From a paper:
Like many Gram-negative pathogens, Shigella rely on their type three secretion system (T3SS) to inject effector proteins into eukaryotic host cells, driving both cellular invasion and evasion of host immune responses. Studies in Shigella have demonstrated that bile salts found in the small intestine (e.g., deoxycholate (DOC)) interact directly with the injectisome tip complex protein invasion plasmid antigen D (IpaD) to support interaction with the hydrophobic translocator protein IpaB and its stable recruitment to the maturing tip complex. In Shigella, IpaD resides at the extracellular tip of the injectisome where it functions as a “gatekeeper” that prevents unwanted protein secretion (leakage) through the injectisome prior to requisite activation events. Here, we uncover critical mechanistic details of the Shigella-specific DOC signaling process by describing the role of a π-helix secondary structure element within the T3SS tip protein invasion plasmid antigen D (IpaD).
A small number of groups, including our own, have crystallized IpaD and IpaD mutants and while some full-length IpaD structures have been solved, proteolytic cleavage of the N-terminal domain facilitates crystallization. Here, we mimicked the previously successful native proteolytic cleavage by engineering IpaDWT, IpaDΔQ148, and IpaDΔY149 to lack their N terminal 121 residues. These N-terminal truncation constructs expressed and purified well in E. coli and diffracting crystals of IpaDΔ1–121, WT and IpaDΔ1–121, ΔQ148 formed overnight by vapor diffusion. Careful consideration of the WT structure suggested that the localized i + 5 hydrogen bonding pattern of the π-helix results from the “insertion” of an amino acid into this region and that removing either the glutamine at position 148 or the tyrosine at position 149 would eliminate the π-helix and return it to a continuous i + 4 hydrogen bonding α-helix. Aligning the IpaDΔ1–121, WT and IpaDΔ1–121, ΔQ148 structures additionally shows that Y149 sterically prevents the F308 rotamer change in the WT π-helix structure. Notably, while very modest conformational changes are observed in the crystal structures as a result of DOC binding to either the IpaDΔ1–121, WT or IpaDΔ1–121, ΔQ148 structures, the removal of the π-helix in both the apo and bound conditions results in a lateral shift of the central helices relative to the WT structure, resulting in a 7 Å translation of the distal ends of the structures.
Author numbering:
A (entry chain B): 124 to 319
B (entry chain A): 124 to 181, 187 to 318
The structure:
Amino acid sequence: DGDQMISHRELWAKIANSINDINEQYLKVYEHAVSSYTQMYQDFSAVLSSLAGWISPGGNDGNSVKLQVNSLKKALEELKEKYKDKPLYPANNTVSQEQANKWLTELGGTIGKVSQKNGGYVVSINMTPIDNMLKSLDNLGGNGEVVLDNAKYQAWNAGFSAEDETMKNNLQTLVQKYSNANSIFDNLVKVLSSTI
Amino acid sequence: DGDQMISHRELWAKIANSINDINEQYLKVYEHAVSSYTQMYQDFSAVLSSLAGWISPGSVKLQVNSLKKALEELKEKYKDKPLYPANNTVSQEQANKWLTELGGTIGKVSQKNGGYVVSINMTPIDNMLKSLDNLGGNGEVVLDNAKYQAWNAGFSAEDETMKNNLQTLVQKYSNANSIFDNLVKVLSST
């Protein structure tokens, strides 16, 4: 109904109510999701740095690689256990199942995963790239340091860097979605100051 | 002021005026800048599609004068085909607003007259012309195999910058439509 009148003063408060609702239920949700994933990937970036001390030349001739997988497996698993309790959304407590499912679609099923903490749910960080690394590590043969000829170190590192490339692509699109979310908020502010 | 009454009908009109303004002043500006830069690179493929015939054994010999006549023609065709605005000029303050939005790597603020435009940054085309210079030669050059790889690597690096310059603009434009789409959605039903 277009005849419904509203004061300029009532309109200012309704705008400030909608803006605050958006920043609280959309902007700050997107920012913390980006926040949690960079810090997750930053800790994984610390394991790639420590990977240098876990790979040295080995073998009879010396062309091969001697990767201590137990040290690398230990670091990737501690990274998993660190972020079981650090979800993308929400930042505090839990929310309903459909609220966790609504923000799973908005963020992406690849980046996040809906989990129940008993009663309430969260959108936890999807650790599929890390878990894919661990089982490929688990299949390398032996339960310790493995001598990897350049042909089969070629195959493992190609898949290891791919799961690393996945988390970067995941972080890139999460950063881009937050960039557009801030731009939608910015435009939504200018469109409403247009009324006065 | 604060006590003046407004109808829901008047609010719809003030919002439709802004969505129209955003389409004319933001989306269609992106649509033209993407197209104008796309036409240039598609024309740059000329010096590219002719590179194979301009290379032959000598060592390696390269027709630099032909490789240079075509690049200097590419700058002439887009000397006055700017990225923003599509027509006439704008303010310099208005032009710098879009130079930052599109990045100083693809745009370049120029003073056409009293007004300003954001022209296409032909620095990669300039970069290749200056290294085609340093090669020397009467009009055709014969190069050591070590330069031809050194030169062809840096030349293809300038083409790779224009390729990444284009798709970066293509994704910035597609994200602009994504912002406009969701901007209407939350406004269509707040």
